[PDB]
């Protein structure tokens, strides 16, 4: 036997980090969830307990600490390319480093209409992500991430002229409630390393509030002839607006709301037009993914 | 043996209802989750396998959906009274009721600076709840509460001056962050009956929206002294401004930031006046509770 | 305003112990998460930000660790009076100490039949619980549970005779599945301090053994009428054998498992004698509670 | 812009299946979780809102409590063949399915040491899995794992001997805790069709079983130098003894469990030889992969 892929690090390492504006008093701060996995010449650790090929999962934490101290970790696209690159430059025998990073929403209060100069809320669990691969003599690729947005729309979503066969019993329907919780991902064109990164900062969090505002806009106001439909509009809206984008990932959850039939009941009428009480389905679920990118 | 108490019936109900505007074309969405249990002369359920004292549980499912259908499902603390009452006197040996109901939060969304008709965004996990203890010749027990409301302040907040004895390792502080997940609850004066809640309907919304209100600026404005402190505040004005209030209860966990000490790495500073990067521990988590009352 | 009630104290704190037999090289490990709520004089860091009543949440953490290095961990309703006595009896001002106690499996593995002396898995997420309230001048009140023991049936349970009225479409009847998760709680008689906890060691962990027998038992052997008339077989039972035990809660959920009917489709038989494939359904569930003292 | 991927289906789609021996009366009960995904020239359903292409995935719903209905459901691996080819073979236009399930355990309950005929215990969380890849002209990937089985083991574990630089603060050790939760994967030589997974039934069950007894033997028995090392002579031993496998994967999270020094307090000795009291770490975990193939 041989070993055909490995990799290892430290998962689950929670960051937060303060910048204190010393002329208006103003604090702002960041938190994160990172993950770092390395790759290299590190087969031996696994087949002959060879220990000394190994920079141990607790010094990579300490790594993630002291290059957050040292550096700014906004954008989490600047931030997980710095980290990456440390990795493959410092260790000869390390040549891939892959970091994931999760950054948690910390939203600064109105406070009698006026921002708060140092207090925070979290307003929903959406999070905004990245992947940063950093392969020696390949650069480094970033997926950057939105996900778990969850909207819902009470109207304006159809679904009919599907396949019917013998193992269908869905009824075609021109008016049904349709929600989600919104994954997208953008892939960025490869980066030749830190110095191309670097002079694209701008871009990023940009395109991140692009991509978002095309999602809910494009939700909002679709007449939404199906899930399909209404995902490859928002795909090709993100790739027309920014051209550093190769591709452009959703995946989405059909989230049912069933109609209630309660005419057993005194004739009750709540299906169709009639219907303004329903019932949420927590499985199963459909899940439709789509991957578009230039032609 | 004997049956000293007993309580049955339908958990995690799931209930969606819109209600349509036919004049604006605006639609609002509520969607809850419920639980009734019910309480009365049904101990031979238990003791002599006798069935017909139960209410089945699917019945009380249809019935949480029939009583959406037929009544308001808003301000919540309506709905779960109309609810626990129609149990009470549709069935004359049941004589308890008890509905807990979780609102879960839809926010209708901007647009392009207007507010969009028909779409909406779940901005966070915080909910609104209320518990119904519906008695019969004992009136309706009413408790609102907002839960998961996470906050963070990253200067203002002060620990010192406690307990100092051979089980203390904890430095006295000056300067710390303090973060928690609120849930306060408000206990209601007892009303007599349907006809005095819905005499009052008008005080639910605008109560649970001044206990938020003081909750986000007290603890964006106390310079804190402890989060006993802070927090009795914030309890201290809910009942001054709502006199049909008797008790305000707040839960409050103290999620820990730490300091990292760099200094082992070429001297880096990250502790005190240096601190920047801090972990975020997930446990333990202290856990302050209170419950403020008239004197 | 008044402070009405107060506690405050740490919680989630995971403790792990292991035990080392000298003579045979067998290890035995013991893992739990504790929570500690204090009581007493300590209105005034509410009220007056007099932080010196406080016995810091950081101190509390540590002294479990401590009493754990200092006292067997087992059976746990001793380790729960053992840290809860302590806290009243070190502290003039504190008078009740509330001691949560959540034990995790951890079941020593057989290899070949053979028991290890040191490796071990964890069968099931099934736990067993304690609640001990130490409280000056009254004793030590102590209520031991298991919770999370997950079980079905798929035949040998019946529902039928319950009332029918005009919010009624369940159908009765005599074969179906019963599945519930168990949580069971017994409540020993009050103990009038340390030196009576002690004499009664060996009753704890013999009667959550035979609370455990008893259910499994019952749920498998009972030509079941219903979950109200099951449940109550079982706390009998355990009343019958423990004289030392006042009082047997269970909570079960009801988890249903519905029938599909797969007529429309080739007119395939799957209902009644013929129900072969169940859609389990997560929500909405039944909560059939009870409490069973001694007559 | 231009679709470049696209698969959609039904998740969360659980599914009970009891079958019944006349003759003795034994029941056996399964419980899966099933997603089944399809792609094929479905593109216009995205760019053009041409739903003829749709098999709805409410269809794909009744069509996996069809297939459960009339074929067997164990091994999984065969019934995902089954289901899968079901997709590929019934549309022209759908040229790949993907299935995945996972198996619960209801394991049956031994009452008085005799095996009950209906009567079931959800034994841990720990999963059987299967991710089965139909594709028209290409055959049947399937990828078999467990997941879920958490072991702890109390000595015999170290680590030492790893790169040392100005980022390393961990200490080497002789003697540690060592726990996980183990995810492995082995993944079969691609099948011809259907036909070629009916002949290699027998093979499912039993390489499951080896699998897991060669998991928990080489954790128990290894005394371990990493656990690089410990999972490489796991993966070794899997391939030596089922020649359809051509790579066995496995994914380890190191879950830390922490020392704790009591020495400020009276001198109390709890670390190295003397430590018996531990801080299990809920977070950060290293995180160790590797996949192993043939030479
Ligand atoms: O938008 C939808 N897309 C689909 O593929 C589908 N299948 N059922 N309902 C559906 N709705
Ligand atoms: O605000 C606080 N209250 C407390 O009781 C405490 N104990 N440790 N840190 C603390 N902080
Ligand atoms: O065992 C049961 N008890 C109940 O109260 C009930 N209500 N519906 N089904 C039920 N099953
Ligand atoms: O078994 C281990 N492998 C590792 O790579 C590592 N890094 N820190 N501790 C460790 N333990
Ligand atoms: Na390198
Ligand atoms: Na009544
Ligand atoms: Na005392
Ligand atoms: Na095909
Ligand atoms: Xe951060
Ligand atoms: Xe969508
Ligand atoms: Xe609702
Ligand atoms: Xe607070
Ligand atoms: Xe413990
Ligand atoms: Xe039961
Ligand atoms: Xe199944
Ligand atoms: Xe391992």
Redesign the interface.
């Known amino acids: ?19 204190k504006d010393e002329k208006t008093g103003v ?1 702002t ?1 960041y ?1 994160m969830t990172v ?1 770092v ?1 390395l790759e290299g010449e ?1 087969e031996t ?3 002959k ?11 990579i ?3 993630i ?2 290059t ?3 550096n700014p970790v906004t954008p989490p696209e600047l931030f997980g390319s710095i980290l990456g690159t440390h990795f493959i430059e410092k ?1 000869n025998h390390i040549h891939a480093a892959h970091v994931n990073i999760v950054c948690h929403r ?1 939203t600064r ?1 109105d ?2 209409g006026k921002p ?1 100069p ?8 959406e999070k905004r992500n990245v992947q940063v691969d950093v392969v020696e003599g390949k650069g480094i690729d970033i997926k950057s991430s939105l996900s778990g ?8 979503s159809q ?5 019917r ?6 009824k075609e329907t021109w008016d049904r ?1 349709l929600s989600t919780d919104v994954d997208a991902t953008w892939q960025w064109k490869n980066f030749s390393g830190l110095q191309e990164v670097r002079s694209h900062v701008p871009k990023f969090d940009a395109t991140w509030a692009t991509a978002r505002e095309v999602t ?2 494009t ?3 679709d007449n939404s ?2 899930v ?2 209404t ?2 509009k928002m ?2 809206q993100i ?2 607006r920014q051209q550093l984008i190769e ?1 452009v990932e959703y995946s989405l ?2 989230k049912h ?1 069933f109609e ?1 039939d ?1 005419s ?3 004739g ?1 009428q ?1 299906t169709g037009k009639n ?6 389905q ?14």
């Open positions: 036997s041989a070993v055909k892929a490995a990799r290892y690090g430290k998962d689950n390492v929670r960051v937060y980090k303060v910048h604090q701060v938190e993950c996995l590190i650790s696994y087949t307990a060879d220990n000394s090929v190994i920079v141990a999962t607790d010094s934490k300490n790594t600490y002291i957050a101290k040292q260790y910390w209060m406070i009698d708060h140092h207090s925070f809320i979290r307003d929903s669990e947005l969850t909207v819902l729309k009470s109207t304006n679904f009919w002229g599907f396949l066969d013998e193992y269908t019993t869905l409630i809910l806009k939700f909002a106001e002839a199906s399909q439909a995902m490859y795909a090709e790739l027309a591709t959850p059909n709301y209630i309660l057993w009941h005194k009750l709540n219907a303004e009480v329903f019932a949420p927590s499985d199963p679920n459909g899940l439709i993914k789509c991957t578009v990118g230039r032609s």
